[PDB]
Write a protein that binds this ligand. Structure first.
Ligand SMILES: CC(=O)N[C@@H]1[C@@H](O)[C@H](O)[C@@H](CO)O[C@H]1O
Ligand SMILES: NC(=O)c1cccnc1
Length: 246
């Protein structure tokens, strides 16, 4: 398991937590020195538990699929909550079975459906460590509309930060003040599968992408990523989604 406490949290401890989260995910190989997530994992070992504590020391446990860093569901006190999707239904066969009741959230876990439920796109939702504190507190007591926004915060401050050093840094810059995500953050989130695929395809193609990926950079400009010497590949991305799952 991994754990993170918001009480006393600072950019350093958050950075350490994200390092630990990345290193909790299994891999058999690296591609251009980036861990390649496994094609599949059978049984309970498929799920990483993240224990998150809000500033007051109240806690939720979050179940993460280690093949794709997708949040499946979470436990708050004696109630489990799972996304309305087959992968999360499966997860519920393995994690939080001791919960006195299971609520299936009235949406799947993807950004499109979460944004509709929250009534707001990601672009307009501030993120940061204070927002994560808020998100944990919200998830403690069921409210599906509120939970959609909280989960958008949770996903980006944990899974997306694990996937991209740039996003980790953006959250560190928001340790004591929330701010909506940069355009670059959104672009990276939207491109994780595509980047992952092209980096794997580049192996056998001399580091050259079969299909370029268009991102927005930290200055707000369009950039085209065509090969593995790009900073997005050498410094930024930290985990690759296996092409078997794309
Ligand atoms: C053949 C090709 O695409 N080369 C590019 C190069 O021009 C660029 O400087 C580098 C970093 O982005 O990525 C690669
Ligand atoms: N459900 C998730 O954890 C999730 C959603 C969208 C993108 N990445 C992860």
């Amino acid at each position: 398991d991994v754990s993170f406490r918001l009480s006393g949290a600072d950019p350093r401890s958050y950075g350490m937590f994200i390092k630990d989260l990345r290193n909790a995910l299994p891999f058999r190989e690296k591609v251009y020195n980036i861990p390649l997530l496994l094609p599949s994992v059978s049984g309970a070992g498929r799920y990483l538990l993240m224990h998150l504590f809000n500033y007051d020391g109240k806690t939720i446990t979050v179940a993460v699929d280690v093949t794709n860093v997708y949040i499946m569901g979470y436990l708050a006190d004696t109630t489990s909550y799972f996304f309305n999707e087959p992968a999360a239904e499966l997860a519920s066969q393995y994690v939080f079975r001791d919960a006195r009741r299971k609520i299936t959230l009235p949406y799947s876990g993807n950004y499109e459906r979460l944004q509709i439920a929250a009534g707001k796109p990601r672009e307009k939702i501030p993120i940061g460590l204070p927002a994560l504190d808020s998100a944990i507190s919200t998830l403690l007591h069921y409210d599906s509309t509120a939970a959609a926004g909280a989960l958008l915060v949770l996903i980006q401050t944990t899974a997306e930060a694990a996937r991209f050093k740039y996003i980790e840094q953006q959250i560190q810059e928001r340790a004591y003040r929330d701010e909506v995500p940069s355009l670059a953050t959104i672009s990276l989130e939207n491109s994780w599968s595509g980047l992952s695929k092209q980096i794997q395809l580049a192996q056998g193609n001399n580091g050259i992408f079969r299909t370029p990926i268009v991102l927005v950079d930290n200055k707000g400009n369009r950039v085209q990523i065509t090969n593995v010497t790009s900073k997005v590949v050498t410094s930024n991305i930290q985990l690759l989604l296996n092409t078997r799952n794309i």
